[model samples]
Target: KYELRRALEELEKALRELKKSLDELERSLEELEKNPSEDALVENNRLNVENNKIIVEVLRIIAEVLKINAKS
Candidate 1:
């Protein structure tokens, strides 16, 4: 039980950091829309890929936690 709680805490922390990065990326892309540089485009693509990956993991963890709650 303690381990599961700890894991949930760590995943929540990661999700918070991921959200911060997503916010920054959104702002950066908003700015890029006006300027549109090649480097920025490449970085934006990279961010999108990594962001999606993290989002999937976060969702998976959330589902697992929810399942545990429902089982209880």
Candidate 2:
């Protein structure tokens, strides 16, 4: 029971961390929008690609964990 609660807490922490990262990313995009860079397009594109990949990966992990819980 304790472990279960710990796991839940950890998951919650991950969610918060992910949220923070995403918010920072949004701010970065906004900055880029306000001031276009000579190579900002490439940099912004790279960041976006990486961000989307991580977001998908995070969702996949959450889904897998939920599936396990559902089975039990």
Q: Local distance difference test, per candidate? A: 0.82, 0.72
Model 2, 1-72: lDDT tens digits are 554565576667767767776776787788889998968777777767767776776686677668667766
Supply the global lDDT for candidate 2: 0.72
Candidate 1 local accuracy as lDDT?
0.82
Q: State TM-scores per candidate.
A: 0.71, 0.64
Clashes of each: 0, 0
| Residue 54 in candidate 1, Cα distance off native in Å | 1.4
Alpha-carbon shift of residue 57 in model 2 (angstroms): 2.6
What stretches of model 2 exceed 4 Å from their correct place?
1-7
In model 1, the Cα lDDT at residue 15 comes to 96
| Highest-scoring model, lDDT | 1
Candidate 1 Cα deviation (angstroms), residue 3: 5.1
